[PDB]
Design a protein around this nucleic acid. Structure first.
Lengths: 85, 127, 210, 98, 76, 149, 95
RNA sequence: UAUGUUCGUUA
RNA sequence: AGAGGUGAAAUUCUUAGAUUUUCUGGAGACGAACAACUGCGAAAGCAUUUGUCUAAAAUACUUCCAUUAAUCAAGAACGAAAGUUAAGGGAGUGAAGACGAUCAGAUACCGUCGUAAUCUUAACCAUAAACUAUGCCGACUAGGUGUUGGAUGAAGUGCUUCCUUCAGUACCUUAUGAGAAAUCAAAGUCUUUGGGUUCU
């Protein structure tokens, strides 16, 4: 059944640290532990290995990404301007 | 021979700048405004102050050799007010009576295509 | 001031007077060469005062100092713009005004940004109040006017482009091409501005002054 | 509406004609020459894509570069798995020939 | 008096007795003498039978047709 | 109009003549074969009727043959498992969802997607109230993309 | 009790109209409600016309006009007498 | 387009 | 040698060159004039160009289905401004605040400055005189002036106008219609009281 009303994955922290701190760390651990879409194989199986490294479990190929998500909006826009030319 | 300057006239419901420069705008010949003509901390926008500002700018231009003037009108700015102040009337009036020749007249008041917020709130000035 | 002295101003050979006025400089004493104090000076000169005709009094040309020899300065085209009073006269309620701009490079490797304006015409038997155009028609008109801009500017040098600014060949052509879609009254190049110019060549400046 | 047209053509092909997806089946089909047209997804690994087009030009068969990846091609074919490679053994009542 | 109304043709569609404003016609291109049926307010491009020539461009209404051809109503 | 405003009385009005037009010397022994060929070549009945009307000059299939086009298409087993309008609404919803997964800020697209999904559910309830849809048909928004078939 | 049928503004088929700012006091006023006067005036009075047109060159020089196009709030327009109070019946007359 | 407040309760 | 600014001033800036003139580069916001008793949108709202994506509506249809519909407690999506959270941005304006004035006082109106905010992204909040103070669907009842978008038919010069019609959107007149009246073509067809429905 539903085990926590709202704390989600931050239930591991119990009552320690502020609720705002726990909520902020939840909002990014959610995307840190997510599985992203591997554009090389098309299977959503790329997970973070270390802080900036993302490896696909299928291709075994790894890319440099954000600290907590496979891509970061700044670099996404940056690449897009280059591709426009 | 007819040598020309450009008289930037600035009338802004306060003092009236009469600023005669060369054609390029740089290298100003004489600027008088209206503050130095009346010593009443006011009346700087008065047509009398503008007339006295112009009828000595004419003398200085005559001494400097400049004999014709291109009038270039300006009304405060893009956010304050678009109509030239009271002294604009007597500015060109006295420039015409001065005896120096007059060429093309243009209104170069800065008109903003934008709408940068003007002073006072959304309720305006209450006085 | 006493230490100042006069200089004469010259205009390119495609105009009429070729001598549009006077400028003055300060002392030439080093390190102020009193010629770098002239170079890069822009003069707003009326077309009426350049060609002795009242018809073109609504246009002013920007002429930029480019070379000093002895006491007379030579200058060159550096942009044009219609006068504020004429522009404000062309705008009336009950009509749609279509504005277009483009960036075009000439064979002389001159980069210009040119802005034209146009308005719709009432024609005769309309017996209505408004000459509003549909947005699709406005878009087509703007595309056509921008195409004409780039077409009759990228095939020429700078000199002949300026030369055709005087008789407004661009405006007549835009009228001719847009008559088929929506009748337009007075359309003219509102403003041409120089974005980038090649490195100065006193040779080429002379081969238009002489 | 640039790729929607071929999506519709491909959907009609699945409805009517007979086809085969997968590297091994595509290679077998156009090695035996039975292939008519070959869709390659934009995601196809480069070595596989190049071997496929070399095979197809040897056997004189057309190759179409699908706009989408192997997920989009998989859905476009009506399946719930990735495709990345498709051969049409015969066109049904589809104008995909031209 | 609404029963014997006679100028209901100029009325809007779905008048006293609803009736389509469209019809069908035959086309004879001079020098072609082709026989084929055409729909007023046609919605897609159409071709001839004897010699292929464009006949009418489909618009929001009765099409533009061609500069020539003898087109005759099919009504009986 | 289900959503929004506007009556929009634009429509097609059938003629009073319920019978086959007298000028039509053609015979209904092959009109159904023609529509069958069209459906096999791949065309939905809504546009089959239109191409029949324009390119064949045989309006009102119901008048040429005493049966309607989807009915005879079913009688030949051609008709698809998902009807015309339900399938078109599904396709539109799929396109909207594909646009939305890229543009999360399109509130207007989100609103229209909700509206078209409501229409999908209403129409689906009707069609499975008739036996024209299996009782377990649901329109999963996750699987609709490939559900088009 | 509903002084005016149009509510003192000219908004229909519309939900929101972007405001402009009064030329006199600077108060925010909806554009469809503001009192707008396109003011086309001579640069100077007729006497200064007469004097400039003789002290000028070209012997035909025409004085440029001034296009101001002011917009005022209701209070400023009434105070500056751009609009009168008007009687109840004449309130409906607009031209 | 400077400033200019107030008027005890009842009948 | 003053400039700002005002009802008049002062605070403020200013020989270290203010304001003013001209040019170049950067920055953020905004998108005038056109621009309307005009358009679009469920409402909030939406105005520089171009491209892509997406949706809607009207019109036309001898195209398809055939009652699939109307309104809806619960529930859901969106929901100005302000406000909150986190990064960025930060010109102009500017709740707070600080001065200068005005006044009997003035913590206000006026002026100089100015923090938050205003802008972007990602989340909240769920409220406005969120107003046509007028719920939604349907039918009927009248003339005229307009105007927006289609469609039909007809004619000065392939172009341009008129007629009819549908769908918007206003306005004016009229009521032996209504209303307490203001007023209302819906707020009418209500003691001659009942088309359906929700909310208060």
């Amino acid at each position: 059944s539903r085990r926590t009303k709202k704390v989600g994955l931050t239930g591991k922290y119990g009552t320690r640290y502020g609720s705002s701190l726990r909520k902020q760390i939840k909002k990014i651990e959610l995307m840190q532990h997510a599985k992203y879409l591997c554009t090389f194989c098309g299977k959503t199986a790329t997970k973070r290995t270390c802080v900036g490294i993302w490896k696909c479990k299928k291709c075994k190929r790894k890319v440099c990404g954000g600290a907590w998500s496979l891509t970061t909006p700044a670099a996404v826009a940056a690449k897009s301007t280059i591709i426009r030319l | 021979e007819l040598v020309f300057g450009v008289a930037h006239i600035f009338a802004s419901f306060n003092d009236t700048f009469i600023h005669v420069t060369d054609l390029s705008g740089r290298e100003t010949l004489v600027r008088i405004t209206g503050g130095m003509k009346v010593k009443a901390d006011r009346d700087e926008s008065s047509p009398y102050a503008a007339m006295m500002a112009a009828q000595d700018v004419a003398a200085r231009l005559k001494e400097l050799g400049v004999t014709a003037i291109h009038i270039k009108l300006r009304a405060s700015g893009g956010t304050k007010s678009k109509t030239p102040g009271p002294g604009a009337q007597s500015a060109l009036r006295a420039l015409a009576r001065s005896g120096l020749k007059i060429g093309r007249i243009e209104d170069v008041t800065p008109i903003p295509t934008d709408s940068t917020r003007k002073k006072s709130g959304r309720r305006g000035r209450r006085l | 001031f006493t230490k100042k002295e006069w200089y004469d101003l010259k205009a390119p050979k495609m105009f009429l007077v070729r001598n549009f006025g006077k400028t003055l400089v300060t002392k030439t004493i080093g390190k102020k060469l009193a010629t770098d104090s002239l170079k890069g000076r822009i003069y707003e000169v009326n077309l009426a005062d350049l060609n002795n005709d009242e018809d073109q009094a609504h246009k002013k040309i920007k002429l930029s100092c480019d070379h000093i020899i002895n006491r007379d300065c030579y200058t060159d085209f550096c942009g044009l713009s219609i006068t504020r009073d004429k522009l404000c006269s062309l705008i009336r309620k009950g009509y749609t005004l279509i504005e277009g701009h483009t960036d075009v490079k000439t064979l002389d490797n001159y980069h210009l940004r040119m802005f034209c304006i146009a308005f719709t015409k009432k024609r005769q038997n309309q017996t209505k109040s408004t000459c509003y155009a549909q947005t699709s028609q406005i878009k087509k008109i703007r595309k056509k006017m921008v195409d004409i801009m780039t077409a009759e500017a990228s095939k020429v040098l700078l000199k002949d482009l300026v030369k055709k600014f005087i008789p407004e060949s661009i405006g007549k052509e835009i009228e001719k091409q847009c008559k088929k879609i929506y009748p337009l009254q007075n359309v003219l190049i509102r403003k041409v501005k120089i974005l980038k110019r090649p490195k100065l060549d006193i040779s080429k400046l002379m081969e238009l002054h002489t | 509406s640039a790729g929607d047209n071929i999506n519709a053509k491909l959907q009609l092909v699945m409805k009517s004609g007979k086809y085969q997806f997968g590297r091994k089946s595509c290679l077998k089909a156009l090695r035996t020459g039975k292939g008519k047209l070959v869709i390659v997804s934009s995601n196809c690994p480069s070595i596989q894509r190049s071997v496929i087009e070399y095979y197809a030009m040897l056997s004189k068969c057309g190759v179409h570069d699908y706009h989408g990846d192997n997920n989009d091609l998989g859905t476009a074919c009506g399946k719930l798995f990735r495709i990345s490679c498709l051969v049409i053994t015969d066109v049904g009542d589809s104008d995909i020939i031209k | 008096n609404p029963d014997p109304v006679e100028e209901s043709k100029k009325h809007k569609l779905k008048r006293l007795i609803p009736t389509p404003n469209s019809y069908f016609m035959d086309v004879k291109c001079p020098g072609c003498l082709q026989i084929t049926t055409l729909f007023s307010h046609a919605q897609n491009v159409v071709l001839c039978g004897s010699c292929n020539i464009m006949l009418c461009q489909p618009t929001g209404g009765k099409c533009k047709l061609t500069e020539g051809c003898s087109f005759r109503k099919k009504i009986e | 109009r289900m959503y929004g405003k506007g009556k929009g009385i634009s429509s097609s009005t059938l003629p009073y003549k319920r019978k086959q037009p007298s000028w039509l010397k053609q015979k209904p022994s092959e009109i159904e074969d023609a529509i069958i060929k069209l459906a096999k070549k791949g065309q939905t009945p809504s546009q089959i009727g239109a191409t029949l009307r324009d390119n064949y000059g045989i309006p009102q299939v119901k008048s040429v043959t005493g049966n309607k086009i989807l009915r005879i298409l079913r009688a030949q087993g051609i008709a698809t498992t998902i009807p015309e309008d339900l399938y078109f609404l599904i396709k539109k919803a799929v396109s909207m969802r594909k646009h939305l997964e890229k543009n999360k800020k399109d509130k207007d697209c989100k609103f229209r997607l909700i509206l078209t999904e409501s229409k999908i559910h209403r129409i689906s309830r009707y069609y499975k109230r008739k036996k024209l849809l299996p009782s377990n048909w649901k329109y999963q928004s996750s699987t609709a993309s490939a559900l088009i078939a | 009790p509903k002084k005016r049928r149009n509510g003192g503004r000219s908004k229909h088929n519309r939900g929101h109209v972007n405001p402009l700012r009064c030329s006199n006091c600077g108060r925010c006023v909806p554009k469809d409600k503001a009192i707008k006067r396109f003011n086309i005036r001579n640069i100077v009075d007729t006497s200064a016309q007469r004097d400039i047109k003789e002290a000028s060159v070209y012997s035909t020089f025409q004085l440029p006009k001034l296009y101001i196009k002011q917009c005022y709030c209701v209070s400023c327009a009434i105070h500056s007498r751009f609009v009168r109070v008007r009687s109840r019946e004449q309130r409906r007359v607009r031209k």
